[PDB]
Amino acid sequence: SASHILIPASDLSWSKQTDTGITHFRAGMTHEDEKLIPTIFRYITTWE
Amino acid sequence: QDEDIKFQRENWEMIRSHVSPIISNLTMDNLQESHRDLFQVNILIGRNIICKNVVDFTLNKQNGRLIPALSALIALLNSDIPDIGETLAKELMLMFVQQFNRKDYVSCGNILQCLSILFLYDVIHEIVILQILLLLLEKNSLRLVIAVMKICGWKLALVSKKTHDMIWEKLRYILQTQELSSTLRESLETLFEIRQKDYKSGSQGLFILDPTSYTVHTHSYIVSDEDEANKELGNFEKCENFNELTMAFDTLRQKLLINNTDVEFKKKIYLVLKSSLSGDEAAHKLLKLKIANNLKKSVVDIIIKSSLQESTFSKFYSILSERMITFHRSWQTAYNETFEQNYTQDIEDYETDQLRILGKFWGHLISYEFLPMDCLKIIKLTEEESCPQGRIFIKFLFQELVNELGLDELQLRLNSSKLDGMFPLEGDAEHIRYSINFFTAIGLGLLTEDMRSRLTIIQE
Amino acid sequence: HIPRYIRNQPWYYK
């Protein structure tokens, strides 16, 4: 999995003009079960 | 029996001398201590002494502020001994009648406040209050009716909504159709504001013992013109029942004495971390968990250990920590103590890879003041109070500091911070030698020169 | 034989 994460959300009008940061989150993949699936990114050491 | 009476003549004064200063010094803050200290003497005979003390307490002009404390004490004493409340419902009532006959309204105010607060505790019946309000209204002393109504009107409305809404129709007729004086008028209008929005807000500020702490005993009295206050109340009375009174007091006192006397959490946090793409997301998820203050340090420990499982440092952990720290002070203090926990206790369990990650992590948080540089006060660069693990940790931490800030900014931040344990400007010379050795050998010697001036003077 | 990803124990247990 890579999509069970929270996707950054912010006012699109401001986002097109300046860096708004991460003021809100929108759901990614979801399921009824109360369990957090790991995301692949947390297992790969970044290039830097 | 003469000898027994002589003994009682002395026992009465013993009780009086013990209970008088207790009542005379009563305050809402020390009420429990006064209540327990009353019961170390036989109060079942000293009922009248306590009642006389209470009457004198209400008559005192300065004790208007302390009346709620007296009322709560009377409630406690009535729950333990109903006769005290029984006789007080009569003596305070007759004392109010007397003080109203002499028109000393300052003491009448204290008595009416005490009786209203006793009403709130069900020590006295509603009948007493409606008689008092009849007596004041047939004289038109609104200033006391208003004061009584602020305190007990909200209960009087539950118990006697008929007479209560008569007193309101009388009070409102006055406000709307009579030529009141301003200081009266604004206090009557403020009683209307109270009823309008929070009728209990007249008895908020008093000390309020919960109903669990006492047992309800209600006493009532009907005032007749012939009745007079007992001016000899509290005087000695022959005690034909001394022995049984003492035995009962024994049972009461002993009653008073007896009555007065994670793998799943780690997993949860770890999965929160491993399910997040960014540090902002991870921080949001952890913050949404609303972790209790006592668990916050353990959460920081889980974050540190998780970061130490990675092959390298990661900005993800620094951003996560930074967002936690800035969210609330309890997180900042959890991180502060986790830093000193790591350097003082955990470093001996860390291998050189883990120390590299940890040094860079804390160096990053310090380099941005999320962790104050004052945290380095726990560092003590000496051959005795440090170990290879700690020195390797310090090396990586300072290497990160210089990489992020540069020599100049690191130098200025260290100068503006008292770090005698790393840059000793005073004290034993060999601490200066060892410190300059460490910092030059890690390549931070440029920081040392300033210190070396002292090292040179020490040679002469 | 049991695969390594089963045999290995998460750090929080040990």
Nearest to residue B165, comparing CAs of B173, B124, B115, B177?
A: B173
Residues from chain A that touch B272, judged by Cβ atoms under 8 A, are 36
B137-143, long-range: CB < 8 A, 24+ apart: B137/B167, B137/B170, B139/B100, B141/B100, B141/B105, B142/B171, B142/B174, B142/B184, B142/B188, B143/B105, B143/B184, B143/B187
Interchain CB contact of A39 with B (< 8 Å): yes
User: B302–C11: do the CB atoms touch at under 8 Å?
Assistant: no
Helix extents (H) in B279-427: 279-288, 293-309, 315-327, 329-344, 352-367, 388-415
C-beta atoms surrounding B90 within 10 Å? 21
How far apart (Å, rounded) are the C-alpha atoms in residues B195 and B281?
A: 50
Q: Considering only CB atoms, which residues of chain C are within 8 Å of chain B?
A: 10-13
How far apart (Å, rounded) are the C-alpha atoms in residues B83 and B245?
A: 13
Cα Rg, chain B, nearest whole Å: 37
- Let me know if B127 is exposed, middle or buried by CB neighbors in 10 A (0-12, 13-18, 19+): middle
- Let me know if B357 is exposed, middle or buried by CB neighbors in 10 A (0-12, 13-18, 19+): buried
Taking each helix axis from N to C end, the angle separating B142-159 and B161-177, rounded to the nearest 10 degrees, works out to: 150
Chains that touch C (3 or more CB pairs under 8 A): B
3-state secondary structure of B137: helix
Q: Solved how?
A: cryo-EM
Mutate to test the interface with B, among C11, C12, C13, C14 (most CBs of B within 10 A): C12
For chain C, the first-to-last Cα distance in angstroms comes to 23
Interface of B with A in 253-312 (CB under 8 A): 271-278, 280-281, 284-285, 310-312
Chain CA centroid to CA B139, Å = 44
3-state secondary structure of B363: helix
Chains that touch A (3 or more CB pairs under 8 A): B
Please check whether residue B207 is in contact with residue B31, taking contact to mean a CB–CB distance below 8 angstroms.
yes
The H or E element that residue B383 is part of is none
Closest residue of A to B268, CA-based? A36
Residues from chain C that touch B266, judged by Cβ atoms under 8 A, are 12
Residues from chain C that touch B263, judged by Cβ atoms under 8 A, are 12-13
Residues from chain A that touch B276, judged by Cβ atoms under 8 A, are 5-6, 39, 42
Q: Name the residue type at position B51.
A: C
3-state secondary structure of B44: coil
B392: tokens are 């390797």
How far apart (Å, rounded) are the C-alpha atoms in residues B66 and B417?
A: 51
CA distances from B199 to B192, B195, B196, B203 (A): 9, 4, 7, 9
CA distances from B429 to B375, B377, B408, B421, B436 (A): 24, 19, 26, 13, 11
Interface of B with C in 235-264 (CB under 8 A): 263
Alpha-carbon gap: A6 to the closest alpha carbon of chain B (Å): 7
3-state secondary structure of B392: helix
Interchain CB contact of B306 with C (< 8 Å): yes
H helix count then E strand count, chain B: 20, 0
Give this entry's resolution in angstroms.
2.3
How far apart (Å, rounded) are the C-alpha atoms in residues B354 and B310?
A: 9
